Amino acid sequence: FDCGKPQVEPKKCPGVVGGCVAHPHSWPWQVSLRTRFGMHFCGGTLISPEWVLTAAHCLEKSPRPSSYKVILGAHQEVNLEPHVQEIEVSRLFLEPTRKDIALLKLSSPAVITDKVIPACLPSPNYVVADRTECFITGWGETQGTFGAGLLKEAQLPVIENKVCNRYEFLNGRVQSTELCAGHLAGGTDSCQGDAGGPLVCFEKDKYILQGVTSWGLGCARPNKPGVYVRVSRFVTWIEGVMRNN
């Protein structure tokens, strides 16, 4: 199984708050991060059999790796599928310049199956173009929209930083190591519970991980697009950690 190529073809959703319920296992890199009592609190992205990429703020207030478990291959949030892989975390690596991104080393390698496949990493320092339609997935808050309890997806366009940072929108808050995605009209967004999961953009024949869900001014509000850590600016760090640990 090559990276970024689901064995169930994803549904499109032109037009997680809003969006739609994903086809089961069409996002086989989506991870659920769980407390010791099994509560989902963040997403993550499998990027190789032993490594999950997530957001630093999902973990930083409880650094000990035994505090976390990783659920792979799931579609429902509760009452997990039978062949779901639950794997413990052996090591945690926070990004050294203190961006909102972090690596989890799994205590044993995930078994790569038709339901558990890594996303591809982008080219270093690639800047996803303005208006590129990408996909954001997770089990987070739906703000009254349908699909709570099931893996949801939002199809949202990238908004280039120079637009997103305008006074009327996020007013200078967005760093070059972040990107914006969403509809400025509002209505569709990642929300609480989605942090740490993927924003992927289809390129040629596979999905490339371009963002890590991070923050926003609320969710799905007009003029307030979601902010994601820009993965391409950390590919060298990610590959260094994986090769040396």
């Binding site: 957001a55 808050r173 740490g196 923050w215």
Partner: peptide
Amino acid sequence: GRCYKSRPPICFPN
């Protein structure tokens, strides 16, 4: 006004 999107979220006055 930032809310980081964990569950529960990490929110600030900014």
